[PDB]
Write a protein that binds this ligand. Structure first.
Ligand code: CLA
Ligand code: CLA
Ligand code: CLA
Ligand code: CLA
Ligand code: CLA
Ligand SMILES: CC(C)=CCC/C(C)=C\CC/C(C)=C/CC/C(C)=C/CC/C(C)=C/CC/C(C)=C/CC/C(C)=C/CC/C(C)=C/CC/C(C)=C/CC1=CC(=O)C(C)=C(C)C1=O
Ligand SMILES: CCCCCCCCCCCCCCCCCC(=O)OC[C@H](CO[C@@H]1O[C@H](CO)[C@H](O)[C@H](O)[C@H]1O)OC(=O)CCCCCCCCCCCCCCCCC
Ligand SMILES: CCCCCCCCCCCCCCCC(=O)OC[C@H](CO[C@@H]1O[C@H](CS(=O)(=O)O)[C@@H](O)[C@H](O)[C@H]1O)OC(=O)CCCCCCCCCCCCCCC
Ligand SMILES: CCCCCCCCCCCCCCCC(=O)OC[C@H](COP(=O)(O)OC[C@@H](O)CO)OC(=O)CCCCCCCCCCCCCCC
Ligand SMILES: CCCCCCCCCCCCCCCC(=O)OC[C@H](COP(=O)(O)OC[C@@H](O)CO)OC(=O)CCCCCCCCCCCCCCC
Ligand SMILES: CCCCCCCCCCCCCCCC(=O)OC[C@H](COP(=O)(O)OC[C@@H](O)CO)OC(=O)CCCCCCCCCCCCCCC
Ligand SMILES: [Fe+2]
Lengths: 48, 38, 30, 93, 245, 170, 42, 56, 48, 193, 42, 30
């Protein structure tokens, strides 16, 4: 809410989220929805 | 490996161009350092 | 500490100017 | 705790805290280790040394060995990090 | 359960059955005697939730966030016993002995690991009614001891009842009149005892086996690491079993 | 063990360069010894290949081309120069003895690689930050307290048992 | 207090493009020395 | 007014500061200044540089 | 084929996650499939 | 001897003399990669706190055994004039018998900035026993250089590091260039005949 | 917190000696190309 | 932030090993 991705200087992170990547392997999403298993296309799996 | 490439050329940088580029990089470093250090 | 960088850049620029004048490629005919 | 007062009454001062000392502190008093020392250590907080005679499962023989060293027993505030380590504090000679 | 006692040790080991509670069959009633005593109370958590501020759709309410266990199958309490005291109206249970604590570590979303001593130590649990029924509700407070004892040494060799009392790798911090007062909270290891609250609820009673069993919900605080971090509230749910005598 | 406990000599990068030169020298001894012995030329009819060499012969007794071919396909990289190969067998252990001599001159003045201060500062204010680094410092504080009364007897170190650092139950 | 990453930005932003041009000039003179054919060609 | 790199300036903000307004158009060489610190306080180096630069 | 497939499958959520949409004030946003707007409001650039 | 008290004698000690008697000024207390001035370690020295004199309940003077230069860490131990252990700060607290709370050690300061001041409670006596094993106790300013808390070496220690390592490396250069002189006729190789 | 001058010591201690050796190798190959006499000599 | 330097030095070392193996100067006879 008060520290979103655009307050933290994230540049490529909004372009991943624009097209569908919300979850990470660390269990969080940017929507706040806690996630069990995002699979391959998390933020980390897209970067790898 | 295929054959030896016939497009291979030599590269030059004479002493004038070295002095012009050394001056350009040092002056751009002089100019932009105060802004990078902020 | 950044004045060390500022001094080194200015003195380094003047050393390039020294070598550009006294170690120049001499223009030669033929 | 950095600075724990009543640190002498644990094992070294030859006056033993009843609430906080390990069972090895009663090895200096003959007759107490192991069965009388085991009953002091296994039961709950005591306000004074007179509450040692209210331990369920004492004898008159186990009471008379307590009255020998009641000069040497004392009751302080039970510090919980010493109360849990009264049977076995991880010290072996 | 009678089924688990039919097996060998070699048939159970490795399988994960030894971390499970017995299931009770039937809806009956047991009226406890004056000398009655729960004996082998198993308490198995099946869900773990840690309280944390979350950013759901536009606001920042407090939510119990579901967390994953990383200490594999060591979390179930078992062999809990203690007398069942019959009051005037109500029936109460005071646990005394048994494996009434299990160190569990859960991981939050973000990688945050939350260790906590899941316990029912010194539980005095008040019930509603006088017999164990499929609607009976027992609940009360317990004491959560500190996750580390005073004998625990930290990575720098400091503990509560043993260890250094200074950051010994920074000897020049012991200088001046202020000393290492900025490092007091890390050098002062404090044994803290907090309170938890469990609410059991019987729904299955076997009268021929004198066995009860139902669900529970418990909340407690996590590890403070000898008073160095602020503890988090851990909500747990699951199944219990007991035998009544 | 005195120089581990009191100086943290394994952590010193000059001992590390010394270990690399000595283990690298024993490696170079074993590889070059076995490569020559397994790329030998058939110069006799005996299965005992030691007899098929003359100390005054001019031919190479082993195939350098086959030895280069072997290690280029096994390891990716092989020696092609026998002169550079044998200089390298000189260079590696001697550099290891010279680099480790530099760091032991530093230990003479107690200019030791003892602590990573950023990990010591973090572990001071965060009492769960544990690495294998901080575990080695507790081993050194055990060495320096338990051996110092016996190893420096002129100093008359009297440590009571209450000040000796121990873990639990040991 | 100045930004600490600017020491890297200025000094690597100076040295690495300057040493690239020193590299280009030196191989230009070495290529002329090799083609000249005497005592510096080898 | 600070003007040099050792008193906290950078290349852009740094300057040889002009002479004092109390001096005005008066000639201020070093030998008319009773100490070099008084000459440096009153903007003496500006007059030395400017007059040698314009002659040069 | 890549422009059509991104529009038909990824963005409309036929075989895709959709894109990020939000309300008019950026409070509640999510990735969801987006139906195409074939009228003149498809050239409204704030219409997803 | 000339009719002054303990407090007047210790106030005559110059702070420059007390500053030399402190283990942070030892050049053998630094590290190879602890970079910078000695002020970067403990801070900039500001004032001498005075000389602590430790006494237990019967009254004889105890002295804290000073840290030797080998030791990064050292146990805090108080001995009397005979070197017999009278008090310490125990690692294990359970069967401890020479703790400062048992023996009842008090500390009196003399000279310095704490000149007439007595501390009798064992928390602050233990704080002063920890700094008394580093020699004379000084008040430092550890916020100007943002000091980390680990001792650095002096320029005396740094000179000896560079020039004894340079001299060792230059011994190899003597062997190389000397062998290159005597053997000059065979440094492209030897003849096969 | 780490020492901020170590970023300069590591990165200039890597790049400047590495670019010196890249300089030496490139002028070695350019000198061989000039002596070879064809299309790369100029 | 120094783990960025540690990663770059290790990955940069492995890139040198890649070029030393697959872009090596081939040993040639005659
Ligand atoms: C970029 C090219 C393009 C394409 C492929 C379409 C396609 C479509 N338009 Mg759209 N339209 C366009 C541009 C385009 N339009 C532009 C620039 C405007 C002005 C902002 C409109 C305004 C518009 C309206 C108001 C409506 C459509 C509708 C439609 C759909 C019905 C086709 C039709 O002929 O109905 C004819 C109906 C009309 C009202 C006439 C408008 C249709 C325009 C003129 C489409 C012609 C563009 C043509 C295909 C481009 C090819 C040029 C060629 C020389 C290369 C069809 C999906 C209709 C629809 O189905 O909405 C859901 C509809 O109501 N269009
Ligand atoms: C992986 C394991 C390993 C390896 C390979 C090494 C390797 C080394 N260690 Mg290290 N070490 C290690 C682990 C290791 N260490 C560990 C875990 C510790 C505890 C922290 C140490 C503690 C340690 C210390 C304290 C020292 C070393 C030193 C060394 C160096 C030894 C130099 C040498 O050859 O001395 C052998 C001796 C010589 C080469 C001197 C000359 C010998 C002459 C020629 C002998 C002539 C004898 C003559 C023939 C007479 C014989 C006959 C007589 C018996 C009658 C070498 C680089 C030493 C060093 O760094 O020196 C610079 C050193 O002082 N190590
Ligand atoms: C090219 C040589 C040169 C010249 C022209 C100057 C000029 C100046 N210097 Mg600089 N200086 C120089 C080199 C020079 N400098 C060098 C090499 C050094 C290092 C040693 C210095 C160190 C230095 C310092 C530290 C200072 C100066 C200063 C000055 C200024 C005043 C000095 C003064 O009063 O002199 C005396 C001048 C005369 C006596 C004038 C002689 C001219 C004659 C008389 C011609 C007149 C002809 C006449 C009208 C004809 C009439 C004939 C008719 C009647 C028949 C003046 C602008 C001062 C300054 O900058 O003040 C702000 C100052 O502080 N200089
Ligand atoms: C044309 C442009 C385009 C772009 C940029 C995207 C982009 C995306 N798509 Mg979409 N999509 C598209 C068109 C496009 N799509 C089309 C045409 C279809 C129909 C086939 C789809 C159907 C579709 C579905 C069903 C899904 C996506 C998803 C995604 C997202 C994650 C996939 C990814 O990043 O892989 C990036 C791929 C590379 C960088 C190439 C990798 C190449 C290496 C060599 C292979 C890697 C090996 C293996 C696959 C991964 C190793 C695992 C290890 C890293 C752990 C990403 C935002 C997914 C999503 O949003 O999940 C949250 C998702 O489920 N897309
Ligand atoms: C005889 C040589 C010598 C000696 C004894 C000193 C001594 C000193 N210097 Mg000086 N200095 C010197 C030469 C010397 N200097 C030179 C040649 C320069 C120009 C580069 C400097 C520039 C300089 C500055 C800017 C500063 C000092 C400072 C100091 C003081 C603190 C030392 C310290 O903390 O080091 C820290 C420890 C080290 C540097 C370790 C040394 C290197 C080890 C042995 C590794 C060897 C290199 C390694 C193999 C290569 C790296 C690999 C690469 C690929 C990354 C100390 C009095 C400081 C001071 O206090 O000034 C007020 C300070 O700020 N020096
Ligand atoms: C990627 C990740 C995450 C990494 C993390 C890993 C990590 C924790 C650390 C790794 C970093 C690391 C490398 C640290 C080590 C640092 C260190 C101690 C450096 C030492 C530096 C140094 C200057 C030391 C001085 C001593 C020195 C010179 C030693 C060099 C040792 C050395 C390279 C030895 C050679 C080893 C080698 C494999 C040789 C094989 C030779 C070989 C191919 C023979 C082939 C061969 C043989 C024949 O006989 C013939 C006939 C032919 C024809 C032939 O071909
Ligand atoms: C014809 C043109 C069609 C368009 C070109 C093909 C699509 C390529 C566009 C880019 C790939 C799509 C983005 C990646 C999708 C993705 O995440 O994959 C994986 C997704 C499902 O991925 C799942 O996603 C889940 C949700 O996040 C979880 O993360 C799961 O872990 C993850 O597995 O599956 C697909 O979309 C795969 C389809 C990609 C296309 C396959 C190749 C088709 C190309 C064949 C055409 C060649 C014919 C030539 C004839 C010879
Ligand atoms: C194709 C198979 C894809 C497997 C996949 O799902 O990866 C999921 C896991 C992470 O799981 C993830 O790991 C997460 C745990 S954590 O955040 O990593 O700690 C976990 O939360 C998450 O559910 C899980 O998806 O990723 C990896 O383990 C793959 C390692 C990368 C392999 C390198 C290939 C080398 C190339 C040469
Ligand atoms: C991660 C990788 C990052 C890569 C970055 C590194 C590459 C960057 C360096 C390249 C720049 C080289 C420029 C060389 C310079 C140089 O080579 O000049 C000479 C060159 C003319 O070359 P000729 O055609 O004479 O060819 C001679 C050849 O030998 C040149 O190769 O001019 C130009 O290149 C175009 C004009 C640029 C003129 C340069 C003048 C700059 C103005 C100076 C401003 C300073 C004074 C201002 C004071 C106010
Ligand atoms: C205990 C002390 C240590 C061992 C002492 C005895 C030395 C081994 C002597 C015989 C070696 C046999 C023999 O001399 O082999 C030499 C062998 C080549 O020799 P030949 O082929 O001529 O002889 C081996 C047989 O073929 C016999 O004809 O060289 C190799 O290639 C060795 C390289 C492998 C490198 C590792 C070798 C180490 C193996 C030795 C350990 C084995 C012990 C077995 C004893 C028979
Ligand atoms: C899994 C199977 C594939 C094997 C994996 C490949 C790994 C191969 C490693 C090659 C490194 C090349 C060294 C470059 C140097 C180079 O390419 O040299 C190539 C060189 C060829 O020498 P020549 O005899 O051709 O040289 C004659 C003259 O050119 C002398 O200058 O061979 C040797 O001198 C080196 C042999 C020992 C090789 C030592 C390897 C060191 C091990 C790696 C140490 C770094 C590990 C760091 C980890 C972070
Ligand atoms: Fe050989």
């Amino acid at each position: 809410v008060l520290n979103p991705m655009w307050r933290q200087g994230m540049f490529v992170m909004p372009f991943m989220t624009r097209l569908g990547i919300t979850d990470s392997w660390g269990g969080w999403s940017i929507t706040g929805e806690s996630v069990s298993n995002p699979g391959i296309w998390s933020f980390e799996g897209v970067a790898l | 490996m295929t054959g030896p490439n016939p497009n291979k050329q030599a590269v030059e940088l004479n002493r004038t161009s070295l002095y012009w580029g050394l001056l350009l990089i040092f002056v751009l470093a002089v100019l932009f350092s105060s802004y990078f250090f902020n | 500490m950044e004045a060390l960088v500022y001094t080194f850049l200015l003195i380094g620029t003047l050393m390039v100017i020294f070598f550009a004048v006294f170690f120049r490629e001499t223009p030669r005919i033929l | 705790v950095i600075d724990y007062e009543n640190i002498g009454y644990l094992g070294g001062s030859s006056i033993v805290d009843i609430n906080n000392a390990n069972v090895r502190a009663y090895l200096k008093m003959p007759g107490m280790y192991p069965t009388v020392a085991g009953k002091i250590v296994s039961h709950g907080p005591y306000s004074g040394v007179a509450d040692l005679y209210k331990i369920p499962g004492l004898s008159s023989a186990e009471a008379d060995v307590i009255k020998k060293y009641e000069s040497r027993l004392t009751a302080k505030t039970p510090s919980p990090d010493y109360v849990i380590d009264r049977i076995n504090n991880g010290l072996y000679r | 359960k009678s089924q688990i006692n039919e097996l060998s040790y070699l048939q159970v080991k490795g399988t994960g059955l030894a971390n499970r509670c017995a299931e009770v069959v039937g809806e009956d009633s047991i009226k406890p005697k004056p000398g009655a005593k729960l004996v082998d109370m198993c308490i198995e958590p099946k869900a773990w939730a840690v309280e944390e501020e979350v950013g759901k759709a536009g606001k920042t309410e407090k939510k119990f966030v579901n967390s994953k266990v990383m200490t594999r199958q060591t979390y179930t309490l078992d062999a809990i016993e203690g007398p069942i005291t019959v009051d005037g109206g109500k029936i109460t249970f005071n646990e005394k002995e048994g494996i009434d604590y299990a160190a569990t570590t859960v991981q939050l979303p973000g990688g945050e690991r939350v260790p906590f001593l899941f316990t029912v130590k010194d539980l005095v649990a008040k019930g509603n009614g006088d017999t164990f029924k499929p609607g009976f509700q027992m609940g009360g407070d317990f004491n959560t001891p500190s996750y580390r004892t005073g004998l625990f040494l930290d990575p720098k060799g400091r503990g509560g009842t043993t260890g250094y009392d200074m950051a010994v790798a920074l000897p020049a911090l012991q200088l001046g009149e202020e000393g290492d007062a900025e490092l007091f909270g890390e050098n002062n290891k404090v044994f803290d005892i907090t309170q938890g609250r469990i609410e059991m609820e019987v729904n299955k009673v076997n009268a021929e086996d004198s066995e009860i069993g139902g669900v529970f919900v418990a909340t407690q605080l996590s590890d403070t690491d000898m008073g160095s971090k602020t503890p988090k509230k851990v909500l747990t749910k699951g199944i219990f079993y007991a035998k009544v005598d | 063990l005195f120089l581990q406990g009191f100086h943290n000599w394994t952590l010193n990068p000059f001992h590390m360069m010394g270990v690399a030169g000595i283990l690298g020298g024993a490696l170079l001894c074993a590889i070059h010894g076995a490569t020559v012995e397994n790329t030998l030329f058939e110069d006799g009819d005996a299965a005992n290949t030691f007899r098929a060499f003359t100390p005054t012969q001019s031919e190479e007794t082993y195939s350098m081309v086959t030895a280069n071919r072997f290690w280029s396909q096994i390891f990716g990289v092989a020696f092609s120069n026998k002169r550079w190969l044998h200089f390298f067998m000189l260079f590696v252990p001697v550099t290891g003895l010279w680099t480790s001599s530099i760091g032991i001159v530093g230990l003479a003045l107690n200019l030791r690689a003892y602590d990573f201060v950023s990990q010591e500062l973090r572990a001071a204010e965060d009492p769960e930050f544990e690495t294998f680094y901080t575990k080695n410092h507790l081993l050194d504080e055990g060495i320096r307290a338990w051996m110092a009364a016996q190893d420096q007897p002129h100093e008359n170190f009297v440590f009571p048992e209450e000040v000796l650092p121990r873990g639990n139950a040991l | 207090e100045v930004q600490f990453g600017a020491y890297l930005a200025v000094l690597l932003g100076t040295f690495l493009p300057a040493l690239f041009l020193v590299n280009l000039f030196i191989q230009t003179e070495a290529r002329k020395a090799g083609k000249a054919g005497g005592q510096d060609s080898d | 007014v600070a003007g040099s790199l050792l008193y906290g300036n950078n290349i852009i903000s740094g300057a040889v500061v002009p002479s004092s307004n109390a001096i005005g158009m008066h000639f201020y060489p070093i030998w008319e200044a009773a100490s070099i610190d008084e000459w440096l306080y009153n903007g003496g180096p500006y007059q030395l540089i400017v007059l040698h630069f314009l002659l040069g | 084929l890549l422009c059509f497939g991104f529009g038909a499958f990824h963005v409309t959520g036929l075989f895709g996650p959709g894109i990020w949409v939000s309300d008019a004030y950026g409070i509640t946003g999510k990735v969801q499939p987006v139906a195409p707007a074939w009228g003149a409001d498809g050239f409204n650039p704030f219409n997803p | 001897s000339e009719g002054l008290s303990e407090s007047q004698a210790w106030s005559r000690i110059p702070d420059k003399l007390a500053f030399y008697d402190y283990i942070g000024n030892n050049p053998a207390k630094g590290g190879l990669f602890r970079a910078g001035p000695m002020n970067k370690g403990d801070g900039i020295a500001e004032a001498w706190l005075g000389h602590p004199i430790f006494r237990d309940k019967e009254g004889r003077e105890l002295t804290v055994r000073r840290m030797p230069a080998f030791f990064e860490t050292f146990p805090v131990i108080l001995v009397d004039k005979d070197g017999i252990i009278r008090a310490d700060i125990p690692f294990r607290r359970a069967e401890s018998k020479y703790s400062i709370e048992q023996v009842g050690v008090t500390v009196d300061f003399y000279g310095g900035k704490l000149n007439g001041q007595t501390f009798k409670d064992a928390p602050t006596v233990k704080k002063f026993a920890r700094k008394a094993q580093l020699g004379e106790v000084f008040e430092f300013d550890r916020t100007s250089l943002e000091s980390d808390g680990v001792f650095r070496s002096s320029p005396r220690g740094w000179y000896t590091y560079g020039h004894a390592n340079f001299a060792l490396l230059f011994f190899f250069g003597h062997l190389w260039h000397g062998g290159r002189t005597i053997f000059r006729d065979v440094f492209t190789g030897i003849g096969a005949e």
